[PDB]
């Protein structure tokens, strides 16, 4: 639900003195937001849920052809009529067959036939339309408070400490205030109506899969169709072959399923999960994250007085940061972790910066663990933890591409 | 099995003094052969049977993907190996997933994965090749002896009177003599090796249907294949999608059946029935029909002496002939029917001609029926039946297209 | 201008007692109309002329790319601007090139460029629309009066004898009365508005040829376009390739002509001649031909008394008629030609019928020629010309398909 | 001809103690080679020249159709023969036209015609094949001796100082020794036969452009063709339309040029310059560069004693290096430039490394300039130039991606 470890992570820095930041969150992106005097926040799109889908029409890709009958007349006795032309379920076709004395006619020549067969649809793809007002954006937010290697990405654990929440914004309720315990509150003013091209396509369901197809390409589809406004199948003939007629009988058969060809045409189309409501992969939700009522807690606790150790030594996170896990030996917590990223032990001016702002031991229990993410400078530096003569340190070297 | 009534009927006239005629018989054609002093014959291709088909290869159009497993390793610990790479039934694929502290790795970055799945073919199309020496042409022959409206097209009935037979010619036995009772014998010298382009294509079986496809188009088919010379499926990946991998697991699924797309590509291809042997629609069999030992029987019987009547009045057959059915009142048969097609009753010179040459009452039973086909001249003429003062007659007018 | 000899000739027979006949005349068809007590008429569509074509838009299929210039800036000095972006005749494109000390920049990296080139259209296809009210149908009519082998199909010659005319019908003037001398007058009430699908397509001109293209297919054309409502070429880039940029210069070239590809897409499209006005191949003009004021002249002249001869013996015209040319030896004309088509010389009842109704020698000059078309019965008949003991005759036999 | 500034530059490091290095040089790549105790070398592919191209065949894409004639005969008089069927330059076609009395025939029906027209090819595309033994690889080599900002990329200037050469390798002479003055000699053993897929395609020339097309796709081309083995155009009809024949005349015209459609099919095909010989864009030439007889000159000259200055301050080259230009005030040259890249002025241990190994003032003239490229460590360092109390220095900070 938060960012550390994700492939797609971006860092957004609030401008100087600004209590808010503009965000563009997408289906796959995880954003880490850092603003002056604010705890660091992760924000990520979880999903987009469109609920009230309405059918536009259906196409049969697999038809059933049964109950074939042919009525026949001799040459010169007029056109055959098959009484099944009265049943709207049946497809009928006028034809002719060679007749003569050998097959029951007094005259030789073309005898009339009329051949019918029941058409039913075995499998159909249903096209549905999305209404822009029935679109829920679900978003996860995480505050970089105290966490461990083990629990950092554990949602229920972070909810536990008032350090994460999930919430929904809709066109109708595009703004949400959510309290984060002692951190106070953040609001998100989003623009859910300018997030998705809702009506430039349909949701089409084909078997176990559903797609986002063009709504024009969908109309031009060459298959038998039904609408709410036309319950009877039209263009049924597309899925049927009237075979060669002979004497007084004629075969009629349905094509095999056309599903495979649909998945063919549906190559570059987005795939989406559909049950009662559709879940959209692609998100483009703009939001303003407001942090005027968010606070950095723990900024004035006394500094932890006892020794720390590295439970996990620093590793490059691949996001242009470095992360450690500390274990704190003391039982004087809650307390502020003295930690800085410096150029040398002889000069303690902070040159690196913390992503986990204001790292904090939050319990009086001994040996609790605290994960800290930071951005050391390029070249050599040291991570120095602890104060006075309890300090520990670790060298770091941050480099980039080798020669090439 | 014979021609009267068929849509596709041609008339072939033996040349003057010639005891044989060259014939080209095709899948659908019925030939009526008339030669000097010979009874009229119908000859038609019944079918072409290729027996000893040999597989060239098979293509899977519907695959089954099961037993998916993924083995995963952390970044810097090397490439994952999935032990299923040892099973030739499984398709495997190297991949990578984002790993870090959050999903069990001491280091952040791309962790190796190796994902396998069993591939089995649910439905395959089998391509077979025809051997030009294993091709039977089955042919029906009919002699225009005595027949009735009722029995004319009845094979067992004509076999009864020695007036029809069926027979086979092969490359190995391309000539057949067949006795036709008192009519004697006819031989057919055919050229079965110059009848079919046997090796310019394959017989391909797709579900319940079989087709004659190009043997080059068949090689270029993009599907997983097996040969007798390679029992293991190759190019299996064509019917599989390795889905997105995440952490330590990855989905793998088979495409749906591709059958429908095959019937698509198989539009202008010939359809053929295949069980143990294939039956070919298209025939082009050249034969010489030899009639030197065939005779017109009944040419010197006494003329029937009693009255005839028209059981069926003359009708245009649509083949440029006219057909009647006579009933013969006499019991002096077997006897020759006196019948001619003349310009007027005052001039009995034959101007029309008989297709049923030498019509004959073949029994002493009273009231037997005899069908007679003939070609009256254009304009007015008369069909005159009987001799002396027992004669009956019917006017005929033969016209063509109205003004236009 | 009339029918004898044409491939596409139909015969239309006025109904009994009817002074008018409904006609459907098409681009290629020639109609012979026969009505009771009326001279026989030929009617044929000559052409359809749409005049007031209006442009809908134009597409350039061959462009000229000239006067290329590139303006370049060093990395860190900002985006290059090419002053030709002010000229609407020029197409411009922002780019980048590798820069460094070696090519005049204090800094290494991507330097900005801006490259322009003049676009002019060398050859364009112009799409025009037809207005249904500006459509002239030109029609030729011919009356089967006296004609010779030589002059029968000679328009100026028939106009000479008041036996042919040409005339126009428009939506605005859909009815025309035209006098035919002593034959009186015929009127044609046509429906020019229900003759052509005028607005389901455009007239498109590509070089020396013009076509009737879909008006939707025409919009979707992927070429640079101009309208009367937009005089500047849009989508010019379609006919240009901006080549690879290097340092401070970049090549830009036009594609070659696209004309050939248009003729490719224009395969099944109708071809039409366009100059000031378009001439349409396809006609479907409905007319009522009214003959209440048309008369058969010559019906009561005295019968020609002298000998005729066959200047040309009877030949099958291939239209289900037979035509002769007579020479008339007498100088008693104008006079009625006694000619009939009979079953035998011993029975002069007319059984054949004249297409050239009331054949007539129209001059007192000796040895004038008169062409006569007729429809003899099937089988044998005679053409008997002259009266009393001056009569000549010719046998005719009319047959149809040989046996087959 | 050398690398500094190029977009595509790679750095190759000779292995420890190794006097040779394996290189893969490609059409666009520039390689900088650094080996122990050797001057740094740049090596780049300049081009690949295939000379002895042989035609395989030619296709006409633009035909000229002229001198049309039609010979015609009346129905029943037999087939027309056009005497131009004797000229191999003419394309002829049998046809039929409606004939009758109106256009000079005694009989009505289909009259025979035979229509011919001269075919000449206006423009043709010629397909040529490359012989793997006639392929020259041209290669530029540069030694990182003394150079200035101004002359570094100036070939004639570097040849001047024995610091660059160009040379050719062929299948027949795949190895080249080239002397570089006081630097000694380098040899390149290349594998020109394993560099290009010479015979998997043809060189096809279409107007002003030439392409590398498949040699199979080239055979299947549907255009009129000629080979050295068949000087007469075959399949000419592809570029001609025999228009509708009428009476005794028939139009015949050539299609327009097909060139545009070729450039269409030739989208993803490589473009190459062809005159007498072809120049190939794509190179893949493997070479072993041997440096056993190459030496670092100047390694034991006395250190320059006077002051340097920065003529150009250090800039990031975008290749993961930094380059400066020094001006040397002294006139004691030739002399060794003391220059090092250190962590701090208080610790002169070299931590950065020189790409311009052993930088050297090569003249006694005052104020000569010397360019130096180097790779400082990440973070802070200093470039220190000069010895004793004549030293100058410049701070450097090398960083990478900002937070994100």
Provide, as residue numbers in chain B, all residues whose Cβ is less than 8 Å from the Cβ of C399. Answer: 378, 400
Distance from D60 to chain C by nearest Cα, in Å?
14
User: Which chains share 3+ C-beta pairs under 8 angstroms with B?
Assistant: A, C
Q: Which residues pair with B69 in a beta bridge?
A: B116
d(CA C11, CA C102): 89
d(CA D72, CA D105): 11
Distance from C189 to chain D by nearest Cα, in Å?
30
User: Residue D331: is it exposed, middle or buried by C-beta count within 10 angstroms (0-12/13-18/19+)?
Assistant: middle
Q: Are B360 and B145 in contact (CB under 8 A)?
A: yes
What tokens were used for A14? 């609030």
Whether B403 and C378 lie within 8 Å, measured CB to CB: no
Distance from A158 to chain B by nearest Cα, in Å?
14
Q: Report yes or no on chains A and D touching (3+ CB pairs under 8 A).
A: yes
Whether C108 and D6 lie within 8 Å, measured CB to CB: no
Whether C378 and B401 lie within 8 Å, measured CB to CB: no
Mutation pick from C3, C28, C63, C108 vs chain D, by most beta carbons of D within 10 Å, is: C108
CA proximity to C211, closest of C262, C138, C153: C262
d(CA D248, CA B14): 39
Query: Which distant-in-sequence residues (6+ apart) come within 8 Å of D236 by Cβ?
Result: D60, D63, D91, D119, D224
d(CA A324, CA A339): 11
Q: Chain C: residue nearest B378 by CA?
A: C379
Query: Which of D98, D255, D315 is nearest residue C107 as measured by Cβ atoms?
Result: D315
d(CA A81, CA A85): 8
Query: Which distant-in-sequence residues (6+ apart) come within 8 Å of A7 by Cβ?
Result: B98
β-pair type (A249-254, A135-143): unpaired
How far from the centroid of its chain's Cα atoms is residue C139's Cα? 12
d(CA C269, CA C291): 39
Q: What is the dihedral of CA B267, B273, B277, B283, to 10 degrees?
A: -70
Domains and CATH numbers, chain A: 1-51+133-194+270-296 (2.60.98.10), 52-61+122-132+195-232+258-269 (3.30.67.10), 62-121+233-257 (3.30.387.10), 297-404 (2.60.40.350)
Whether A260 and B263 lie within 8 Å, measured CB to CB: no
Give SS3 for C259.
helix
Q: Which residues pair with C45 in a beta bridge?
A: C139
β-pair type (C347-350, C339-344): antiparallel
Whether B5 and A264 lie within 8 Å, measured CB to CB: no
Mutation pick from C35, C403, C404 vs chain B, by most beta carbons of B within 10 Å, is: C403
Give SS3 for D235.
coil
d(CA A101, CA A110): 13
* Residue whose tokens read 């090689």: B219
End-to-end Cα distance, chain B: 37
Whether B13 and C403 lie within 8 Å, measured CB to CB: yes
d(CA C330, CA A395): 136
Distance from C314 to chain D by nearest Cα, in Å?
10
Neighbour count for residue B194 (Cβ, 10 Å): 11
Query: Which of B320, B379, B404 is nearest residue C403 as measured by Cβ atoms?
Result: B320
Beta strands in A51-159 (DSSP E): 54-72, 90-99, 109-129, 135-143
Give SS3 for C355.
coil
Q: Which residues pair with D379 in a beta bridge?
A: D398
Whether B10 and C404 lie within 8 Å, measured CB to CB: yes
Q: Are C143 and C161 in contact (CB under 8 A)?
A: no
d(CA B280, CA B270): 9
What tokens were used for C170? 């428009």
Q: Are C107 and C74 in contact (CB under 8 A)?
A: yes
Give SS3 for A182.
helix
Residue B228 phi, psi dihedral angles, 5° rounding: -60, -25
Query: Which distant-in-sequence residues (6+ apart) come within 8 Å of C373 by Cβ?
Result: C4, C144, C317, C321, C322, C323, C354, C355, C356
Distance from C154 to chain B by nearest Cα, in Å?
23
Distance from B12 to chain C by nearest Cα, in Å?
8
d(CA C151, CA C363): 15
Query: Which of A10, A398, A400 is nearest residue D404 as measured by Cβ atoms?
Result: A10
Whether B98 and A316 lie within 8 Å, measured CB to CB: no
How far from the centroid of its chain's Cα atoms is residue C87's Cα? 46
Asked, as a colleague might, if the bond just before B74 is cis with ω within 30 of 0, I would say no
Mutation pick from A379, A395, A402 vs chain D, by most beta carbons of D within 10 Å, is: A379
Q: What does the DSSP 8-state code read for residue A108? A: -
Resolution reading in Å: 2.1
Neighbour count for residue A196 (Cβ, 10 Å): 19
Whether C380 and B375 lie within 8 Å, measured CB to CB: no
d(CA D382, CA D400): 18
User: Residue D305: is it exposed, middle or buried by C-beta count within 10 angstroms (0-12/13-18/19+)?
Assistant: middle
Burial C171-182 (b: 16+ CB within 10 A, else e): beebebeeebee
Residue D402 phi, psi dihedral angles, 5° rounding: -65, 175
Q: What is the dihedral of CA C123, C125, C126, C130, to 10 degrees?
A: 150
CA proximity to A351, closest of A326, A369, A373, A375: A375
d(CA C352, CA C321): 10
d(CA B8, CA B43): 12
C&D contacts, CB < 8 Å: 89
Query: Which of B321, B375, B378 is nearest residue C378 as measured by Cβ atoms?
Result: B378
HSE, side-chain direction, 13 A CA sphere, residue C150: 5
User: Residue D267: is it exposed, middle or buried by C-beta count within 10 angstroms (0-12/13-18/19+)?
Assistant: exposed
Provide, as residue numbers in chain B, all residues whose Cβ is less than 8 Å from the Cβ of C375. Answer: 403
Radius of gyration of chain B (CA): 35
Whether A378 and D401 lie within 8 Å, measured CB to CB: no
* Residue whose tokens read 């879940």: A279
Whether D399 and A380 lie within 8 Å, measured CB to CB: no
d(CA B359, CA B303): 11
Whether C312 and D101 lie within 8 Å, measured CB to CB: yes
Q: Which residues pair with C294 in a beta bridge?
A: C184
Q: Which residues pair with C201 in a beta bridge?
A: C214
Provide, as residue numbers in chain D, all residues whose Cβ is less than 8 Å from the Cβ of A11. Answer: 403-404
User: Which chains share 3+ C-beta pairs under 8 angstroms with C?
Assistant: B, D
Provide, as residue numbers in chain A, all residues whose Cβ is less than 8 Å from the Cβ of B7. Answer: 98
Q: Which residues pair with A285 in a beta bridge?
A: A25
- Order of strands across the sheet with A308-316? A308-316, A322-328, A368-375, A353-354
Q: Are A343 and A303 in contact (CB under 8 A)?
A: no
Which residue numbers of A have CB closer than 8 Å to D's CBs?
10-11, 13, 320-321, 375, 377-381, 397-404
d(CA A178, CA A188): 9
Which residue numbers of D have CB closer than 8 Å to A's CBs?
10-11, 13, 320-321, 375, 377-381, 397-404
Provide, as residue numbers in chain B, all residues whose Cβ is less than 8 Å from the Cβ of C13. Answer: 403
Provide, as residue numbers in chain B, all residues whose Cβ is less than 8 Å from the Cβ of A27. Answer: none
Whether B4 and A102 lie within 8 Å, measured CB to CB: yes
What tokens were used for C187? 């009127």
d(CA C315, CA C324): 7
Give SS3 for C224.
coil
Which residue numbers of C have CB closer than 8 Å to D's CBs?
4-7, 98-103, 106-109, 149, 152-153, 207, 255-261, 263-264, 312, 315-319, 323, 325
CA proximity to B33, closest of C403, A99, A101: C403
Distance from C322 to chain D by nearest Cα, in Å?
10
CA proximity to D263, closest of C260, B250, A262, B342: C260
What stretch of H or E contains B203?
strand B201-206
């Amino acid at each position: 639900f938060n960012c550390l470890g994700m492939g797609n992570r971006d860092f957004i820095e609030g401008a100087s003195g600004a209590t808010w930041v503009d965000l563009v969150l997408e289906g796959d992106s995880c954003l880490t937001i850092m603003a002056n005097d604010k705890p660091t926040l992760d924000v990520r799109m979880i999903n987009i849920e469109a609920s009230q889908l309405a059918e536009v029409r259906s196409y049969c890709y697999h038809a059933s052809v049964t109950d074939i009958s042919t009525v026949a007349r001799c040459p010169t006795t007029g056109e055959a009529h098959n009484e099944k032309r009265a049943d709207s379920s049946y497809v009928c076709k006028q034809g002719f067959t060679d007749r003569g004395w050998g097959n029951g006619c007094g005259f030789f020549g073309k005898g009339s036939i009329d051949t019918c067969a029941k058409f039913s649809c075995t499998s159909k793809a249903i096209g549905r339309t999305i209404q822009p007002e029935n679109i829920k954006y679900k978003v996860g937010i995480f505050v970089h408070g105290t966490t461990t290697s083990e629990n950092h990405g554990n949602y229920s654990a972070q909810v536990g400490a008032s350090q994460a929440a999930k919430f929904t914004v809709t066109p109708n309720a595009p703004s949400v205030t959510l309290k984060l315990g002692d951190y106070g509150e953040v609001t998100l003013d989003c623009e859910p109506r300018s997030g998705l091209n809702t009506e430039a396509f349909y949701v089409m369901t084909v078997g176990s899969k559903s797609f986002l197809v063009h709504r024009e390409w969908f109309h031009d589809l060459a298959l038998p169709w039904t609408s709410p406004s036309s319950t009877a199948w039209r263009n049924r003939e597309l899925l049927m072959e009237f075979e060669g007629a002979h004497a007084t009988k004629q075969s009629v058969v349905a094509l095999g399923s056309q599903e495979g060809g649909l998945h063919q045409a549906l190559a570059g189309a987005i795939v989406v999960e559909y049950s009662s409501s559709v879940m959209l992969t692609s998100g483009h939700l703009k939001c303003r994250l407001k942090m005027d009522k968010l606070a950095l807690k723990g900024t004035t606790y006394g500094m932890c007085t006892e020794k720390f150790s590295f439970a996990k030594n620093p590793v490059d996170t691949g996001h242009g940061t470095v992360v450690i896990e500390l274990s704190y030996s003391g039982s004087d917590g809650p307390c502020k972790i003295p930690i800085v990223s410096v150029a040398s032990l002889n000069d303690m001016t902070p040159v690196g910066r913390l992503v986990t702002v204001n790292p904090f031991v939050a319990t009086s229990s001994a040996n609790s663990k605290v994960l800290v993410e930071m951005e050391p400078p390029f070249g050599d530096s040291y991570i120095v933890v602890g104060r006075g003569d309890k300090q520990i340190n670790h060298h770091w070297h941050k480099a980039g591409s080798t020669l090439g």
